[PDB]
Design a protein around this nucleic acid. Structure first.
Ligand SMILES: Nc1ncnc2c1ncn2[C@@H]1O[C@H](COP(=O)(O)OP(=O)(O)O)[C@@H](O)[C@H]1O
Ligand SMILES: [Mg+2]
Length: 652
RNA sequence: AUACGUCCUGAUAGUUAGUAUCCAUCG
RNA sequence: CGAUGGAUACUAACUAUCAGGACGUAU
């Protein structure tokens, strides 16, 4: 039954116009979400493909693609591979790319024609002298509105500025919302001018888009606001939260009265029980008890190695949680087979919304595909568990629900035994399952919120309020299919503030849509204007060799310290000490000092130059330490830590 | 009625310090 | 799990401007 579906792409007229304009000179493309900018980028890549066929040893060039997150790089690589005939490769941080030497990087450059990877990796390659910007043919900045202050985009731009104008590559950027944070309507012009100066380009908007052409293809859902109140609570729930409050009070009294071997341990206990209180308030007693038994398992793990006082505190906490369990036994909704009443009013409202949506779509032949957006990861995990349990209960109207979740990921040589784990392959598998149609619901954090082409959706639910203009715009634009719905859940007493914020957002959008028409080219004087480096970098082998920028000193120092062979449990870390002195002008002056662990050969402390701010003093001290360390003979030619073992140390 | 200096309040812009959360790199 | 970096929101202090209130001086 499967039929192949080639795109057989026929570009739309505004795409052709934008392609010509971008070919003429540097540009930034500003268009609404879902209007098809990735195909424009693909067309531009294909147009200039006659400069890539040459070998790399004889000065051949390559094309690069810059992306923020991992699902995005996978998806864009797949699209480019499908549409054109060139070879594409994808690089991320899972594979452990820093351990590679120069020869393997040269081989990788020789193998492919187009390279797609994250921005931080590109910065690392640029700094350590593996590649030079004179060999790049074209650069693409996905979501270019992130290049502000100290973001890695700005650092790469600083690298680009020094190069002579004879051999500078072309620049193209794609964005939908031009301003990152929230601001008054009077600062929009200043913000766009700053961005134009930073990226050394002018913004462009098609004349045909304003006339029908792109309105048909752009996505616009409907907005609905649903209100709930959390004051209305069950008396038993009030009793439980009062008991938890008095437990918090007595634990605080114990902390204030009883001395502690580690105050941070009881502070952690207090914050995790406050988290338990928050979980109860937001979700309900059953989810709280599930987290409580997970906590029970956590101290089952912990009791192998713990202190006596810490274990007594843990056991009195266990006693309190056990009393909570006996209180819940009287409220055994699952035993009573009526679990609808116990949940917090917010969860009840969400369930009512889902039921109404299913009732509406019962007549509709099309299936359902929805996304739920949550702020923190633990809430997402607990919500997924609860929804799966309700579906397994097999009641009247929850027999069709299938749920899964996606969050960020971590990796370590250690086991990291925990309830929540993630990996690149598992994340890709879940996304593929969602695309195919195995699951109908997805519970996600802000990882997938931006830029992901989602399967045709009908429903987006905001479990938490948007924080600024950009997040609101992107979350609105995530739904793609026709006749979509956008739903926001708001507490009763914050609805006026949310209303005024929505009005301000609409005004900002209206102003932005008009200001971008018929703009003027930027001036190179502003490009020469921006300069935040108070101290020049450290270049031992010349301008084109390796460098250690002021911003990257501390990370390199900590990497060297971590690579030092020592005990597994002990994680060595340099110690910092700040001394403040007042100058003749009575201005604030900061001088920092540094020390190293006794394992490293460098015994003597190192002192940096005085700086107006504490962070600047710390950076200066780190830079001086790095220069001295290289002078002594630790770091190798490429200015990265040497793979030195005990035998290597003995030989040297 | 106005200007100058002083004290208090609100907003705007910038700087500094603290708390919470998210995303990337490493062990 | 730990370590590092970047971004957002909240609070406090300082500086400058604006707005208002009060005081003294001069016009
Ligand atoms: N020429 C075209 N013909 C058919 N579909 C297209 C064309 N150009 C773009 N599209 C569709 O429009 C959607 C645009 O999404 P995408 O380009 O990934 O991000 P953006 O929302 O920034 O444009 C894609 O899913 C693609 O399938
Ligand atoms: Mg895109």
């Amino acid at each position: 039954m499967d039929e192949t579906d080639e795109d057989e792409f026929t570009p739309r007229p505004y795409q052709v116009e934008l392609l010509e304009r971008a070919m003429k000179k540097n540009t930034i493309v500003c268009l609404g979400t879902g209007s098809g900018k990735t195909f424009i980028a693909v067309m531009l890549i294909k147009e200039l493909a006659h400069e890539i066929r040459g070998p790399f040893n004889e000065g051949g060039k390559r094309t690069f693609f810059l992306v923020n997150t991992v699902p995005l790089v996978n998806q864009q690589a797949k699209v480019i591979r499908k549409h054109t005939s060139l070879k594409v490769g994808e690089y991320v941080g899972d594979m452990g790319v820093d351990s590679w030497n120069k020869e393997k990087w040269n081989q990788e450059f020789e193998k492919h024609q187009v390279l797609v990877m994250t921005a931080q990796i590109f910065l690392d390659i640029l700094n350590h002298g593996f590649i030079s910007l004179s060999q790049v043919n074209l650069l693409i900045f996905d979501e270019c509105h992130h290049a502000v202050k100290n973001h890695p985009y700005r650092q790469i731009m600083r690298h680009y500025k020094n190069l002579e104008q004879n051999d500078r590559p072309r620049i193209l950027g794609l964005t939908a919302s031009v301003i990152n944070s929230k601001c008054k309507p009077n600062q929009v012009e200043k913000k766009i001018k700053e961005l134009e100066a930073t990226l050394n380009s002018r913004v462009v908007t098609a004349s045909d888009l304003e006339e029908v052409a792109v309105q048909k293809y752009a996505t616009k859902p409907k907005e609905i606001i649903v209100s709930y109140n959390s004051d209305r609570k069950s008396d038993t729930s009030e009793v439980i939260e009062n008991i938890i409050n008095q437990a918090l009070e007595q634990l605080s009294n114990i902390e204030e009265t009883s001395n502690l071997n580690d105050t941070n341990s009881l502070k952690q206990i207090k914050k995790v029980l406050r988290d338990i209180k928050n979980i109860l308030d937001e979700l309900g007693p059953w989810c709280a008890h599930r987290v409580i038994k997970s906590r029970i398992r956590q101290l089952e793990k912990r009791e192998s190695e713990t202190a006596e006082e810490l274990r007594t505190i843990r056991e009195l906490l266990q006693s309190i949680f056990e009393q909570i369990i006996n209180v819940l036994k009287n409220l055994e909704k699952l035993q009573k087979n009526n679990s609808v009443e116990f949940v917090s009013p917010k969860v009840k409202k969400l369930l009512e919304i889902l039921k109404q949506y299913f009732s509406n779509n019962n007549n509709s032949s099309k299936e359902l595909c929805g996304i739920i957006f949550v702020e923190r990861r633990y809430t997402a995990y607990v919500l997924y568990k609860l929804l799966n349990e309700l579906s397994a209960k097999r009641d009247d109207d929850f027999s069709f629900i299938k749920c899964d979740f996606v969050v960020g990921h971590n990796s370590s040589p250690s086991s990291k035994e925990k309830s929540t784990e993630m990996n690149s392959k598992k994340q890709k598998e879940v996304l593929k399952k969602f695309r195919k149609g195995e699951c109908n619901l997805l519970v996600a954090t802000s990882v997938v919120e931006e830029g992901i082409d989602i399967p045709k959706c009908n429903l987006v639910v905001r479990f938490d309020l948007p924080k600024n203009f950009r997040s609101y715009v992107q979350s609105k634009g995530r739904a793609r299919a026709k006749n979509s719905k956008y739903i926001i859940m708001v507490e009763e007493d914050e609805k006026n503030k949310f209303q005024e914020d929505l009005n301000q957002y609409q005004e900002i959008e209206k102003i932005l849509l008009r200001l971008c028409h018929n703009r003027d080219a930027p001036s190179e004087e502003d490009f020469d204007s921006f300069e935040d480096e108070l101290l020049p970098p450290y270049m031992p082998y010349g301008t084109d060799g390796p460098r250690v920028t002021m911003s990257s000193a501390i990370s390199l120092l900590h990497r060297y310290c971590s690579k030092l062979p020592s005990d597994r449990f002990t994680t060595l870390t340099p110690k910092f000490t700040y001394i403040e002195q007042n100058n003749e002008e009575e201005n604030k002056m900061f001088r920092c000092t540094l020390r190293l662990p006794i394992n490293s050969p460098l015994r003597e402390p190192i002192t940096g130059q005085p700086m107006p701010s504490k962070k600047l003093a710390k950076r200066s001290a780190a830079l001086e330490a790095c220069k001295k360390l290289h002078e002594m003979g630790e770091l190798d030619d490429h200015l990265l830590p040497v793979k030195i073992s005990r035998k290597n140390a003995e030989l040297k």
